[PDB]
Amino acid sequence: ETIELKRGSNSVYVQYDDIMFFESSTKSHRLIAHLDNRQIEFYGNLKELSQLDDRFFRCHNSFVVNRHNIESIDSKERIVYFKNKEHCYASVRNVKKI
């Protein structure tokens, strides 16, 4: 369950469940892997990442979440909470499918 996060000159290798979620941001050309203790930018695409494993799920245009690290979901406000206290958002379309 190892994923290579290509950073540029170097890669970081982490386990699937080290990842809370992946984020696309308009402020970077790189995606952001939200790990338990820090964020790491890397080159990738959300669609491909969602296909690596059933636990990964595209819940928003900007986010692919790791279901194994979800603590709770507020379906009304569409907020997804992770074990490390980070959150992301879910679209109306996908919130109930997470």
UniProtKB/Swiss-Prot annotation:
It is found in: Cytoplasm. Residues 3-98 form the HTH LytTR-type domain. Required for high-level post-exponential phase expression of a series of secreted proteins. This is Accessory gene regulator protein A.
